[PDB]
DNA sequence: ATCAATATCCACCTGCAGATTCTACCAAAAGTGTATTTGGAAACTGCTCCATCAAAAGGCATGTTCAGCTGGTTCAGCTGAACATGCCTTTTGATGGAGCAGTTTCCAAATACACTTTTGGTAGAATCTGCAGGTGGATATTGAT
């Protein structure tokens, strides 16, 4: 609610219609408007349970109300809102086959890629049929951790708990599996505006920017950014120019195109890591310069706000400070994951044993 | 309330197998030296193990009913303690005679050192099979009436 200097929306809109004022000023004002209306999301719309804990989340890119989610026990759910047709389910071993990475297929929306603790990077349908296994550990106590895909390049990529990343085509053709790190890789991600430089994060207190076509020589990498603590995720923006990274103790950093090494800014925020808790992953908003993250208080962290609850915090990217706080009782669990729709009208949250939807207010005639 | 009557304890005494100590003989304990091998400081490395302390399933802390134990009481019948009284085995010394423990000695044969050759046991990859779980059906079990 509390917001900084800004005014004259209809004025700015007409000035844009005249060509006087540039578009980004309007974009700033409307980012402010979106946060303002986000302060009226307070009425939590929907809750959804199933069995063992949620571990990974993904949005159907084309459709707003549908979402896919993967559990701690190999349990996948596909769920649509306003349908009430008893959502789609598939079970797994339930104990040690925790899926941990999940993105939709841009081609066949009723498919999905997945990375499992069983040691099986697979591509499987929501109907149960395993389409194709992509890799394998072939030795237990060695499993996969990370996964992503790109369509413009037609590439698939996935990371391990030991330090090596794999890169395949949609029809196999594996020319990769060189080692990148010495320990587990939490997240990996591809650029949207270009197609052939990559980002990876790990427990090594380092996050790495790669050139997936040019480097082949066992740590002849392109760039390496250090950290004070491990990193749970490093995710690109949709514009491709601002890279977000998130630690385990208390930090977020924004790196630019210009000198990947040096940082533009650091966004301190506590999301302290824990064993049985699902690891925390900050995320962009696809069409603004906002960031949305879940909080996990630490009594020792120097809080700027005087009220410290298990809240969902939102920030502006290119400034550093906050603009909104989501909270709803009956949901005092801790939203490990939070992801806005690529559409831009709906938000999904993953708490322990719960999936939540935070949509906007329904008005009265 | 006392008294009769057993058994034991406390004090003194005298004489003896065991205690002790003194004495002669000695293989074992300390000296001395060389030869050979060993804990322990330093480094390395890679398995295993404690710090952290959300959130739900399900086990436990509480509270209730009432049904079988426990633990008091009673008492009739059976028994071990006490004891007499007698008497057969055990003791214990003594002796006398046969076997065995140990003590020596010699010696073929049982056995350790050590060189060298092969190979059963181990371990990591590769394949299989059957206990778990599941599901359903037919029998057994159990308590109110």
φ/ψ (deg, to 5) at A332: -75, 5
CB A329 under 7 Å to nucleic chain B: no
Report resolution in angstroms. 4.5
Protein A244 CA to nucleic acid B12 C1', in Å?
A: 111
CB A183 under 7 Å to nucleic chain B: no
Protein A220 CA to nucleic acid B25 C1', in Å?
A: 91
b/e code A166-191 from CB counts within 10 Å (16+ = b): bbbeeeeeeebebebbeebbbbbbbb
Question: What sign does the CA torsion over A170, A235, A184, A57 have?
Answer: negative
Residue A66 neighbours by CB distance under 10 Å = 19
Question: What sign does the CA torsion over A161, A296, A253, A239 have?
Answer: positive
Strand (E) or helix (H) holding A67: strand A66-71
End-to-end CA distance of chain A: 25
CA distance A274 to A251: 16
Question: What sign does the CA torsion over A247, A251, A255, A259 have?
Answer: negative
Q: Could you tell me which residues are beta bridge partners of residue A130?
A: A124
CA distance A361 to A89: 29
Protein A141 CA to nucleic acid B15 C1', in Å?
A: 91
A299 nearest nt, CA–C1': B53
CB A258 under 7 Å to nucleic chain B: no
Protein A354 CA to nucleic acid B64 C1', in Å?
A: 38
**Are A154 and A193 within 8 A, CB to CB?**
no
CB A48 under 7 Å to nucleic chain B: no
Q: Which nucleotides of B are covered by protein (CB under 7 A)?
A: 51-56, 125
CA distance A103 to A298: 31
Q: Which residues of A spanning 101-160 put their CB closer than 7 angstroms to strand B?
A: 139
For residue A36, CA distances in Å to A11, A42, A321 come to: 18, 12, 15
CA dihedral of residues A255, A268, A295, A254 (deg, nearest 10): -10
CB A87 under 7 Å to nucleic chain B: no
Protein A329 CA to nucleic acid B79 C1', in Å?
A: 83
CA distance A124 to A133: 8
Q: How was this structure determined?
A: cryo-EM
- A69: tokens are 């989610």
Protein A311 CA to nucleic acid B15 C1', in Å?
A: 106
Protein A74 CA to nucleic acid B62 C1', in Å?
A: 39
Protein A74 CA to nucleic acid B132 C1', in Å?
A: 20
Q: Could you tell me which residues are beta bridge partners of residue A349?
A: A338, A356
Instruction: Give the orientation angle of helix A9-18 with respect to helix A23-38, to 10 degrees.
Output: 150
CA distance A159 to A142: 11
For residue A329, CA distances in Å to A67, A104, A311 come to: 23, 31, 10
Q: Which residues of A spanning 266-295 put their CB closer than 7 angstroms to strand B?
A: 274-277
CA distance A245 to A231: 7
H-assigned helices in chain A: 9-18, 23-38
3-state secondary structure string across A233-248: EEEECCCCCEEEEEEC
CA distance A178 to A152: 24
CB A308 under 7 Å to nucleic chain B: no
């Amino acid at each position: 609610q509390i917001l900084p200097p800004c005014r004259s929306i209809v004025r700015t809109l007409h000035q844009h219609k005249l060509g006087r004022a540039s578009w980004p000023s309007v974009q700033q004002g409307l980012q402010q408007s979106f946060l303002h209306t986000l302060d009226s999301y307070r009425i939590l719309q929907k809750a959804a349970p199933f069995d063992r804990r949620a571990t990974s989340l993904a949005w159907h890119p084309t459709h707003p109300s549908t979402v896919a989610v993967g559990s701690k026990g190999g349990d996948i759910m596909l769920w649509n809102f306003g349908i009430k047709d008893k959502p789609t389910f598939i079970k797994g071993i339930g104990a040690g086959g925790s899926i941990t990475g999940l993105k939709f297929n841009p081609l066949n929306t009723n498919q999905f890629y997945a990375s499992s603790m069983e040691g099986t990077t697979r591509l499987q349908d929501f109907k149960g049929n395993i389409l194709r296994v992509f890799a394998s550990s072939d030795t237990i106590n060695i499993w996969f951790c990370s996964l992503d895909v790109s369509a413009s390049s037609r590439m698939v990529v996935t990371g391990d708990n030991v330090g090596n990343v794999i890169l395949l085509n949609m029809d196999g053709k594996e020319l990769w599996n060189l080692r990148m790190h010495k320990k587990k890789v939490t997240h990996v991600a591809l650029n949207p505006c270009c197609d052939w430089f990559l980002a990876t994060a790990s427990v090594d207190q380092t996050v790495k920017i790669w050139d997936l076509r040019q480097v082949r020589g066992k740590a002849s990498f392109l760039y390496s950014l250090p950290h004070r603590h491990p990193v749970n995720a490093a995710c690109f923006s949709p514009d491709g120019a601002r890279l977000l990274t998130t630690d385990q103790k208390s930090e977020i950093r924004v790196y630019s195109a210009s000198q990947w090494d040096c940082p533009l800014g650091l966004i301190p925020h506590p999301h302290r890591h824990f064993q049985h808790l699902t690891p925390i992953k900050a995320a962009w908003h696809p069409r603004y310069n906002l960031i949305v993250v879940g909080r996990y208080p630490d009594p020792n962290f120097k809080s700027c706000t005087p009220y410290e609850l298990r809240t969902i915090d939102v920030f502006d990217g290119n400034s550093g400070k906050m603009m909104c706080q989501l909270y709803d009782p009956e949901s005092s669990g801790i939203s490990s994951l939070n992801e806005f729709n690529p559409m831009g009208d709906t938000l999904a949250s993953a708490m322990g044993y719960h999936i939540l939807i935070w949509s906007q207010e329904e008005a009265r005639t």
